[PDB]
């Protein structure tokens, strides 16, 4: 709820034709603008050329936004989501005037689903905190995904980077007799892939041993 | 050459078909046996089969092992060095009697060369190792390493260097002591597999 209201008060800049792929066989592009009665998805044409093949259309949808703005989005059909060719995108106001131009590569705009099954335990010997987790559901090329872990003290900024492929993390500099909340996020790795960090996964809290 | 006389003595182990690839576009297979007078390449049949492909015969060879046994080796032609698909190998005597049967995957029997140009400098009271990967090898960034640290004067410690990293930064090392380092490499998963290479020429440094 807090984060909800936190978003409402935020500050956005200029509108952008934003695009992303969740699994490497889809693509959703969108943008947002203010309302205007008589302005529905039919007013815009989202066309897209793709590696010398003919331009094609994408049916635009309209959805409401918590901040009172409307967003228009198109999701490309599976067959047109090749991961390494220059997809050109074009959007025009029925009045002829162009709204956006953007040439992207699907592999360059990855935004995965957050990781799952984050579980936490203490190492049998040391007693340190050992973190394990599984990669985002139904997503390919797992060994190419790097992560980042956030460690909060029930403190200060502590975020551990995790070499791509590895879904385990053992922490050792933690105070004893303390509750720590962890949460991990994912990202496609270079150089083949590029994109954005995912949302955080459901968190887990855990006490540390009395003395270490 | 003491290492040389040592290998002559060291106890045996069961006969076995062994295969390995060096530069990931080559494959050698072989076995050793009692050098009984008479035998030769002609007395044995060595053929392989890549899936969805025909059985082919391999031109066997024979050479004396340093220890006295005979090594019969076949070396697949370049074009048949396809990695990810299952390779089958049947070595049977001319009499039909079966000898060996091993199904492998080329990418899973890599015995790289040992690293080169290893160097150990000084820092923050710390020691920094740096080295090159086995010369003329592709997929460089798929090779993980391991460093051997053995303190001179009447010992040891070992570090697992992660993939594609050709530099190690050693910390905890007792003051005035003479250390002798070394490094060895092997192909790393998910794609590859294999065995540890030999060591690289070592380097000593007095702290």
């Amino acid at each position: 709820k807090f984060e909800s209201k936190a978003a409402l008060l935020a500050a956005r800049g200029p509108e952008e034709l934003l695009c992303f792929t969740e699994r490497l066989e889809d693509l959703v592009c969108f943008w947002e603008e203010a309302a205007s009665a008589g302005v529905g998805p039919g007013n815009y044409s989202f066309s897209y050329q793709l590696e010398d093949e003919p331009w094609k259309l994408c049916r635009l949808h309209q959805a409401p936004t918590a901040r009172g703005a409307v967003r228009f989005w198109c999701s490309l059909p599976t067959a047109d989501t090749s991961s390494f060719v220059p997809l050109e995108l074009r959007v025009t106001a029925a009045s002829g005037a162009p709204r956006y131009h953007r040439v992207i590569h699907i592999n360059e705009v990855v935004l995965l689903d957050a990781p799952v099954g984050l579980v936490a335990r203490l190492a049998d010997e040391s007693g340190h905190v050992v973190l394990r987790w599984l990669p985002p559901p139904e997503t390919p090329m797992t060994s190419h995904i790097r992560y980042e872990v956030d460690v909060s003290a029930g403190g200060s900024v502590q975020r551990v980077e995790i070499l791509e492929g590895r879904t385990e993390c053992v922490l050792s500099n933690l105070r004893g007799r303390t509750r720590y909340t962890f949460a991990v996020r994912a990202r496609m790795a270079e150089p083949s892939f590029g994109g954005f960090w995912s949302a955080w996964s459901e968190p887990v809290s855990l006490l540390t041993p009395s003395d270490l | 050459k003491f290492e040389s006389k040592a290998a002559l003595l060291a106890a045996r182990g069961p006969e076995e078909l062994l295969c390995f690839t060096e530069r990931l576009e080559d494959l050698v297979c072989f076995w050793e046996e009692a050098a009984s007078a008479g035998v030769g390449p002609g007395n044995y049949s060595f053929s392989y089969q890549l899936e969805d492909e025909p059985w082919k015969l391999c031109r066997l060879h024979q050479a004396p092992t340093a220890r006295g046994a005979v090594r019969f080796w076949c070396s697949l032609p370049t074009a048949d060095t396809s990695s990810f698909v299952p390779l089958e190998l049947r070595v049977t005597a001319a009499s039909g009697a079966p000898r060996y049967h091993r199904v492998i995957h080329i990418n899973e029997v890599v015995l790289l060369d040992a690293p080169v140009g290893l160097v150990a400098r000084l820092a923050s009271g710390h020691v920094v190792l740096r080295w090159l990967p086995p010369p003329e090898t592709p997929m460089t960034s798929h090779i993980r390493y391991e460093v051997d640290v053995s303190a001179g004067n009447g010992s040891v410690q070992r570090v697992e260097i992660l993939e594609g990293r050709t530099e190690c930064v050693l910390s905890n090392l007792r003051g005035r002591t003479r250390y002798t380092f070394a490094v060895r490499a092997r192909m790393a998963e998910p794609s590859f597999g294999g065995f540890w290479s030999a060591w690289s020429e070592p380097v000593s440094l007095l702290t």
Binding site: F84, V85 | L24, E25, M139, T140
Partner: peptide, 16 residues
């Protein structure tokens, strides 16, 4: 699918 191959550092894949 793509036409990949080996190389110095890692996989090289041109659009097949």
């Amino acid at each position: 699918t793509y036409s990949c191959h080996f190389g110095p550092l890692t996989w090289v894949c041109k659009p097949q």
